[model samples]
Target: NVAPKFLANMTSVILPEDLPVGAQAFWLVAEDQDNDPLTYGMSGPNAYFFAVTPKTGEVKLASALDYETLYTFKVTISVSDPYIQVQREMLVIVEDRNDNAPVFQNTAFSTSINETLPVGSVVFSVLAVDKDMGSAGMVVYSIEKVIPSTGDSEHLFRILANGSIVLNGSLSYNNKSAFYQLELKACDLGGMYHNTFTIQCSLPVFLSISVVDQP
Candidate 1:
């Protein structure tokens, strides 16, 4: 039987530039007036596309989403135990911010190693920070940035929360080149508003390279 449902809260989320292409991860937690957990039922196209963790009240993306685009979503939640059936609709607004940027521990971070090391080796790790909350950080490492000095204007680098770099497996370090210089950068999800520093030092990256061998 149909139950009384509240007006779903609707919001507009401006997706961050760092959001991957395709579908995105999201969650809708519901509770009664007493803040008790409620079971959720969703409607609309692509509803329930992602996974929901009832135990921890967490949600994740089943697919990726396009960057710089607006996405619309609707969620309905109801109480389940004795079928206390009351449902409510909610809208999630994803706002885009500049919370992603490549980073290193030092402005001149470097590593030295034997030239014989294989390409695509675990090069020195690079770290970055993002201000976006929730799913924004889930796939942030996939968003990469390209440095200008690499000659190949198309070359890009990945960022991890722990700050590491994943070398392309196909490239060879011994025969190709001895070192790489990269200009790293950092930006918050909210762009300038999230950046409170005057010098943008919070958003600066530099030219650095890894020798591909353990230091």
Candidate 2:
């Protein structure tokens, strides 16, 4: 009798990155020349990540697939008859998922500026990181809110999309308080849902302007 062979195409397979855990993702089928019963087995570094049916050759995910953790997997499938065994290797590629949130490198940032400095001076920069791939990992920075003593916060300072803090107006040397605070937010596209949604994370930053006598 001829050795059992894969009845279906065993080419490279791609799975969506957002596939939830325990979801059936693929089916492997094999047939023998004498119509003998065939048992199936899979082996690979990521083989434990999936479940395979020995009798029906069905494959299901055993755990969640995080693109940030593992992006690709190579697994070999073995189809065996009573005595003959055939093997094939297949590649599984995991697509991107916007499951990760942008993280601020500094939870709180503090800096000092000279009161004599002119308007439009760069105050400081806020940094953040995202583990997600592509647009989902791209971070945009903005000021969410400001805690001001008297005047409007927007009138004094502005935050650029790149996280640069700039003085929108001149600072005062006689101001009662030297400290100002603002809430900064980092936003990015949600990876799943066709990128229609957005995810944001925020942190607080403080600025202190020192009154310096200039001749």
Candidate 3:
């Protein structure tokens, strides 16, 4: 019986680039100077192995890989003349994956707040969701920017984990400026998702001066 011997200059193969965050598509192809092609399949002690299509040279991932895990794939090419066989290993570094989007319990939530409430008053609660697992799912709440009716500058607000809002000790309404317009914002740990909403506050109408009798 005759068999081919391994012959190749490079010891390992080189991959094009890292895979995308979520589900991705990839293709693999190998050829020699003499137009010889290589075919790959399962061959290892452990059941875990690489996936490859000999006809179309397509590779599909069976399971999702970790962000920092580096995968190595070894491919062997063989010819029948003197039975030439060459093995090449390629390294694939999976990048971090992002599959989470911030979701609000209610887009437009309303709350009846008192105009005379003291500083650090608890207004209303807002809720948000993060689909990602682990720390990626840890959502944070905040009031990024606020718009006041009296042409006031931007102000900051605080939000607790339970979705409670505080005035940050810097918000105060004047006697003339009873009504106020505010904007609340919420964000998640991933920093890729956020939500904002407008808040409307009304107060009892009161006039300091008295009007004369009308004709």
* 67-94 per-residue lDDT for model 1 (tens digits): 3443445554443433465545555445
- 89: Cα error in model 1, Å: 34
Better model by TM-score: candidate 2 vs candidate 3 = 2
Global lDDT of model 3: 0.43
How do the predictions measure up, each by TM-score?
0.33, 0.81, 0.44
Please name the candidate that would achieve the greatest lDDT relative to the true structure.
2
Better of 1 and 3 by TM-score: 3
Q: Write the per-residue lDDT of candidate 2 for residues 36-70, one digit (tens) a residue.
A: 99888888787887889888888898878777777
Candidate with better TM-score, 1 vs 2: 2
lDDT scores for all predictions?
A: 0.45, 0.74, 0.43
